[PDB]
Amino acid sequence: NKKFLPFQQFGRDIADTTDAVRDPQTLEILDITPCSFGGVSVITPGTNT
């Protein structure tokens, strides 16, 4: 929902990476949310139980 000037293409975050973009073919404001959510947690009781 930001204010992209027509030359402004790349939104940067505080972490200085790519945040918000625009298609060079069609003028449109986009937002990016990265994939690879978290890790694997395993719950188990005692094996003898």
Partner: protein, 50 residues
């Protein structure tokens, strides 16, 4: 041509000061609410502009 100016005055190149002028976008990259800082070919503050 070779015709000179009518009232060409031989004046020296006098000096003033660029107060906050010469602040350009370093690239075509959008930012939001951050305090970025970088080095590029700038207009220095308060220097003798002709």
């Amino acid at each position: 041509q070779c015709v000179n100016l009518t009232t060409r005055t031989q004046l020296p190149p006098a000096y003033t000061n660029s107060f906050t002028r010469g602040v350009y976008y370093p690239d075509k990259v959008f930012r939001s609410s951050v305090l970025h800082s970088t080095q590029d070919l700038f207009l220095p503050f308060f220097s003798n502009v002709t």
